[PDB]
Amino acid sequence: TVSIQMAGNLWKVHVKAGDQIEKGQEVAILESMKMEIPIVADRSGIVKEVKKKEGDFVNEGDVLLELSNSTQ
Numbered sequence: 001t002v003s004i005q006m007a008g009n010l011w012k013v014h015v016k017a018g019d020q021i022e023k024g025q026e027v028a029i030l031e032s033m034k035m036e037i038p039i040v041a042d043r044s045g046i047v048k049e050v051k052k053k054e055g056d057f058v059n060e061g062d063v064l065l066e067l068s069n070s071t072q
């Protein structure tokens, strides 16, 4: 559902399975080879799963989130 958009490392994560999110809410942050990039919820919903965690490696198009309200 929500995915990373840049090569980097998932510096922080702010979501868990069962948590509520809203479009534009911060859900993770990239370090990106010493740059900083907020990762915000592409849509509102309840998180079904988080496909990554704090400090995991990530890339453009690499998954981040699955939601019980994207399933629609």
Ligand SMILES: *C(=O)CCCC[C@@H]1SC[C@@H]2NC(=O)N[C@@H]21
Pocket: 011, 031, 034, 035, 036
């Ligand atoms: C390079 O020196 C290794 C660590 C890089 C950490 C980066 S710098 C930009 C991001 N902000 C932060 O606090 N840590 C990330």
